[PDB]
Amino acid sequence: MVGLIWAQATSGVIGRGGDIPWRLPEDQAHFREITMGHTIVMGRRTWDSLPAKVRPLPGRRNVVLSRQADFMASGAEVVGSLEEALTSPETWVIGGGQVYALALPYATRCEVTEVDIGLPREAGDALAPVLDETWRGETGEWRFSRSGLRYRLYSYHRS
Amino acid sequence: MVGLIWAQATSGVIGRGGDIPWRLPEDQAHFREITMGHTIVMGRRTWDSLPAKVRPLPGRRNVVLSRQADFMASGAEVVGSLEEALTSPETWVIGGGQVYALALPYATRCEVTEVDIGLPREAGDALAPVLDETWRGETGEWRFSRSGLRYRLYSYHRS
Numbered sequence: 001m002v003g004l005i006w007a008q009a010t011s012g013v014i015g016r017g018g019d020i021p022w023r024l025p026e027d028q029a030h031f032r033e034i035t036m037g038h039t040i041v042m043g044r045r046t047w048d049s050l051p052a053k054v055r056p057l058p059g060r061r062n063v064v065l066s067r068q069a070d071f072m073a074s075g076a077e078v079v080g081s082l083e084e085a086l087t088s089p090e091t092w093v094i095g096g097g098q099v100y101a102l103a104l105p106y107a108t109r110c111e112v113t114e115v116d117i118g119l120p121r122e123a124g125d126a127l128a129p130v131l132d133e134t135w136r137g138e139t140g141e142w143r144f145s146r147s148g149l150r151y152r153l154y155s156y157h158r159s
Numbered sequence: 160m161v162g163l164i165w166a167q168a169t170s171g172v173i174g175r176g177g178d179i180p181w182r183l184p185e186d187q188a189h190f191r192e193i194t195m196g197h198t199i200v201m202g203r204r205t206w207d208s209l210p211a212k213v214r215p216l217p218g219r220r221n222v223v224l225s226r227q228a229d230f231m232a233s234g235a236e237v238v239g240s241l242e243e244a245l246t247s248p249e250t251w252v253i254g255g256g257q258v259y260a261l262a263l264p265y266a267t268r269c270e271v272t273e274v275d276i277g278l279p280r281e282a283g284d285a286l287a288p289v290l291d292e293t294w295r296g297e298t299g300e301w302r303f304s305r306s307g308l309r310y311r312l313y314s315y316h317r318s
């Protein structure tokens with residue numbers, strides 16, 4: 001299986017300035033459940049944002065995707081192509097904008113946390129990918145995060 | 160990833176007299192999506208309850224469990240133990256009440272439908288198995304069927 005998991009504002013923004021303009025610990029915990037024990041695949045420009053001590057994410061096969069035939073990533077594989085990263089029954093694309101649209105033809109699951117924030121698509125913002133009509137998904141109800149923003153999960157599937 | 164998929168009345172009842180005592184077509188498209196393309200595994204009794212002109216289920220690796228070796232499951236694969244039947248990146252156990260309880264010690268995922276119907280448990284009914292104490296699950300909204308029923312989706316992942 002190949003699933004994508006992201007959190008987006010309602011405008012569709014996932015990131016800005018090479019980082020994320022929110023922090024919901026309820027999404028930290030959902031994201032950790034989904035991914036734990038499986039392969040996680042992330043863009044190089046996502047691996048760096050991650051401080052050296054939080055990294056690699058524990059108990060998961062960390063794969064960074066880069067063009068650099070000699071990128072370092074202590075504690076992960078660096079692979080130059082997506083398919084190289086497929087040989088677990090569960091592989092989770094965890095960001096960001098470039099790698100999302102790249103893995104979208106491989107994906108049968110999308111796990112979306114929708115964050116109820118007015119965040120206009122301005123900058124060189126990274127955005128969530130486009131889910132066309134082949135994607136069936138169950139919308140959630142707004143839960144209140146302790147940070148103060150609302151949110152709700154989304155699970156999309158196509159066979 | 161072993162997953163179990165079942166449609167449940169709030170009491171737990173999933174079958175009775177070899178039939179499923181409701182109609183809710185949204186569950187059928189839901190069940191069809193998650194299982195399509197993968198191995199599906201069922202108990203013998205469940206194989207029997209499908210009219211021949213709609214079994215085996217299209218596009219899926221039909222397998223039947225029975226303890227009796229010589230059984231004809233025409234278009235499926237008669238296997239003598241659950242383990243011998245779990246061969247795919249994605250195996251979905253689809254009933255009935257006996258195999259679920261047999262399969263759950265090997266599951267990582269449960270996809271539950273919950274039909275809003277007073278259906279008291281009745282001696283000899285097939286029942287959904289028991290979960291919520293190491294299974295974390297994300298619910299979803301009380302949907303409204305075109306049969307008329309209220310029903311909601313659960314997706315469970317065991318921590």
Ligand SMILES: NC(=O)C1=CN([C@@H]2O[C@H](COP(=O)(O)OP(=O)(O)OC[C@H]3O[C@@H](n4cnc5c(N)ncnc54)[C@H](OP(=O)(O)O)[C@@H]3O)[C@@H](O)[C@H]2O)C=CC1
Nearest residue numbers: 006007015018019043044045046066067095096097098099
């Ligand atoms: N759920 C969320 O809200 C998430 C948000 N984010 C945000 O997303 C943003 C980062 O995403 P983005 O900015 O799009 O960059 P990415 O995170 O998509 O990483 C981009 C890198 O992917 C590599 N790459 C792309 N295509 C290929 C290929 N075909 N072969 C090999 N390597 C390839 C390049 O690495 P190189 O440059 O080495 O070639 C590129 O720099 C950040 O702001 C981050 O905070 C991140 C994760 C999740």
Ligand SMILES: NC(=O)C1=CN([C@@H]2O[C@H](COP(=O)(O)OP(=O)(O)OC[C@H]3O[C@@H](n4cnc5c(N)ncnc54)[C@H](OP(=O)(O)O)[C@@H]3O)[C@@H](O)[C@H]2O)C=CC1
Nearest residue numbers: 165166173174175177202203204205225226254255256257
């Ligand atoms: N989501 C839902 O609501 C669903 C509901 N159902 C309902 O479930 C009910 C039937 O389920 P149930 O009555 O529990 O019977 P099952 O469908 O669970 O089939 C039970 C059979 O499994 C086989 N079996 C059990 N343990 C083993 C083992 N260790 N090794 C090999 N074979 C084994 C036996 O086959 P044998 O006797 O051949 O040895 C036994 O008869 C029906 O009413 C059906 O409609 C069905 C599917 C889904």
Ligand SMILES: CS(=O)(=O)Nc1ccc(-c2nc(N)nc(N)c2C#CC2CC2)cc1
Nearest residue numbers: 005006007023025027028031046094095113
């Ligand atoms: C300090 S933190 O852990 O709380 N920040 C935090 C928490 C959760 C997420 C997150 N959420 C969803 N829904 N999907 C995702 N792919 C991610 C991710 C990621 C890559 C590590 C960057 C992102 C940041």
Ligand SMILES: CS(=O)(=O)Nc1ccc(-c2nc(N)nc(N)c2C#CC2CC2)cc1
Nearest residue numbers: 164165166181182183184186187190253272
């Ligand atoms: C119009 S209907 O409701 O009466 N038909 C119908 C009946 C049952 C389901 C269903 N659902 C979930 N969630 N799990 C499942 N294992 C099943 C099953 C099964 C039979 C083994 C094939 C879907 C539709």
Ligand SMILES: [Co+2]
Nearest residue numbers: 033034035036
């Ligand atoms: Co998992």
Ligand SMILES: [Co+2]
Nearest residue numbers: 108158159193
């Ligand atoms: Co599938």
